[PDB]
Amino acid sequence: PHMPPLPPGWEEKVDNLGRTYYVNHNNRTTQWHRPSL
Amino acid sequence: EHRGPPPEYPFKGM
C-alpha cells in the first residue's frame, strides 16, 4: 500500500548501505521505524 | 530488524 506522509520536523534518509531511516530534527534523533501522524 | 542502530543524527547541522 501507499506511504502516509511524514510529520513536520522529520526527514527520510538513506544510509551508505542503502537502508532507509528517519531523522527527527526536533528531537535530534534517528530511528528505523517510519513515523506517523 | 537491522544491523545496528541507524546512523546518528547529523549533529553538525546544529
Author numbering:
A (entry chain A): -3 to -1, 193 to 226
B (entry chain B): 234 to 247
Sentences from the paper on this structure:
Several sets of host cell machinery facilitate this process, including proteins of the endosomal sorting complexes required for transport pathway, which mediates the membrane fission reaction required to complete viral budding, as well as angiomotin (AMOT) and NEDD4L, which bind one another and promote virion membrane envelopment. AMOT and NEDD4L interact through the four NEDD4L WW domains and three different AMOT Pro-Pro-x (any amino acid)-Tyr (PPxY) motifs, but these interactions are not yet well defined. Comparative structural, binding, and virological analyses reveal that complementary ionic and hydrophobic contacts on both sides of the WW–PPxY core interaction account for the unusually high affinity of the AMOT PPxY1–NEDD4L WW3 interaction.
To obtain structures, we screened a series of different high- and moderate-affinity AMOT PPxY–NEDD4L WW complexes for crystallization. Each conserved residue in the PPxY motif makes canonical binding interactions: the first Pro/Leu residue binds in the “XP-groove,” where it stacks against the second conserved WW Trp residue (Trp525 in WW3). The second PPxY Pro packs against a Tyr/Phe residue from the second β-strand (β2), and its carbonyl oxygen forms a hydrogen bond to the hydroxyl of a conserved Thr (in β3). The fourth Tyr residue of PPxY binds in the characteristic “Y-pocket”, forming a hydrogen bond with conserved His (in loop-II between β2 and β3). Thus, the core WW–PPxY interactions are very similar in every case and apparently do not explain why AMOT PPxY1 binds WW3 with unusually high affinity.
